[PDB]
Design a protein around this nucleic acid. Structure first.
Ligand SMILES: [Ca+2]
Ligand SMILES: [Ca+2]
Ligand SMILES: [Ca+2]
Ligand SMILES: [Ca+2]
Lengths: 272, 272
DNA sequence: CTCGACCGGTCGAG
DNA sequence: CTCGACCGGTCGAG
């Protein structure tokens, strides 16, 4: 028996024995991992411990997926990690392309974070230095996916910060705090969401709109969701035309330019 | 053609056309993702945008893995995420079990973070309140995987903080700063590593041992690696018996108990 | 090459 | 049920 065969067979034995006896899969698989690693390092002292750990991984992956072929596994993980890093960029780019075709006629455009970074470096952004510094900090910490600007007196101003998520699933507990900081800094702060399934839970409606003990204030000025459900306070429906986002951006730009002192969290579109 | 067939065929077409023309796979796959999402939302207005995005995912995963079967993909990801969350726990538990069989005869034991959390809550840890508070902060932020204690005058003291990683690959740029804070707090701060391949790079030797412009000070008191390479300053070899870790723990406990003021980053085992 | 950031099913303990 | 933390090949721009 070579070390790899030994690990495969030993992990399976210890898992099965432990699971029949204690009836807890998570405890049993950890025991199988730990005890197979220890046993194999004893039975095979001259094999690198990292290689043994990889054989244990193989055994655990086979049990939990039914797939023993390390090439299949590698290929799926490679593809998944490709999607994980590129798809969010593709979706931001999509929003920018869709939004800019509509916003252009009102003097506005959406920028990627790297667009805004280059424009700040080329001194193309007219905001006050205090804003520029704050935006540079948001860019540094990768807080917002997109930014939106408005042209006024031949100068371009960033007035809004945008989170654009392909899953509204979970990221929103950690996305709310920086959105509230953007509202505190007197920027329009909004989110664009692909899937509204998470808003099934009352918790997530409360995270956006506020008004409960856990979530006293709204977390955004507006949340734009790709669905056909009617508006719930600051949770608005959009489709490929981004209509309410574009019409609210018009109003936000106006108020940011002319009455910015009232652009804290209380600001809401369509109230005038 | 239903929307799913449309997405599969359209992603493939746009990718291939764009890749032959511009010769950049990452640009081309993002264009295929963006333009297939837009095209499909137009061709299929009554399909939920999230479902379209899932069909685009399917197409991208098929191109990059060769696997079209969504069940295979789901099963591999499920298994991978199981390994990702449980294997690190199994390895910590393994170190605790291995270490404690040896350390017991010298009045020492290794605790999991959750062990130390329970013992602090049950007032079983004799450290000064200043230490207790600091440890509670480290537990809160999940900084260390394991802790080590020593019994003195019938009281148990935490004297060391331990990082225990199954890949020394990357985590170490982010693990160094909290280890240096533990040394600043006058605890023994060490790391136990499964795979030393990353120490091929001079950068990572420097991260542990210090003495360069990028890394002026050592990042740990000691790094214990499962390999047979001879000691490089504070990078020590171990196998399943953890020998140098156990012998250095003896010395660390002694010095923490009796001359703790000199247990900053400069402390090193075996120098007396 | 370097190197920081990305994700989401699962784990774990409520 | 809730809910915060885990990872590592890839992306992206050096
Ligand atoms: Ca309100
Ligand atoms: Ca419509
Ligand atoms: Ca030194
Ligand atoms: Ca040995």
């Amino acid at each position: 028996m070579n070390f790899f065969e030994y690990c495969i067979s030993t992990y399976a034995k210890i898992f099965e024995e432990t699971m029949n006896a204690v009836g807890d899969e998570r405890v049993s698989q950890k025991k199988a991992i730990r005890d197979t690693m220890i046993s194999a390092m004893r039975e095979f002292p001259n094999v690198e411990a990292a290689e043994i750990w990889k054989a244990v991984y193989s055994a655990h992956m086979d049990r939990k997926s039914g797939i023993a072929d390390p090439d299949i596994i590698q290929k799926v993980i490679s593809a998944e990690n490709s999607w994980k890093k590129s798809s969010g960029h593709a979706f931001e780019e999509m929003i920018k392309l869709l939004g800019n075709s509509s916003l252009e006629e009102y003097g506005m455009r959406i920028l990627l974070q790297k667009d805004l970074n280059m424009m700040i470096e080329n001194q193309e952004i007219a905001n006050e230095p205090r804003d520029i510094n704050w935006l540079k900090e948001q860019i540094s910490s990768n807080v917002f996916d997109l930014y939106i600007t408005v042209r006024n007196n031949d100068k371009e101003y960033v007035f809004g910060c945008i989170q654009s998520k392909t899953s509204i699933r979970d990221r929103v507990t950690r996305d709310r705090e920086p959105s509230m900081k953007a509202m505190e800094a007197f920027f329009w702060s909004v989110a664009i969401c692909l899937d509204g399934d998470f808003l099934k839970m009352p918790k997530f409606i409360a995270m956006v709109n506020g008004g409960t003990s856990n979530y006293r204030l709204n977390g955004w000025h507006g949340m734009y969701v790709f669905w056909d459900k009617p508006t719930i306070d600051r949770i608005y429906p959009i489709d490929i035309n981004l209509e309410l986002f574009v019409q609210h951006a018009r109003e936000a730009a106006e108020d940011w330019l002319h009455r910015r002192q009232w652009f804290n969290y209380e600001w809401k579109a369509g109230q005038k």
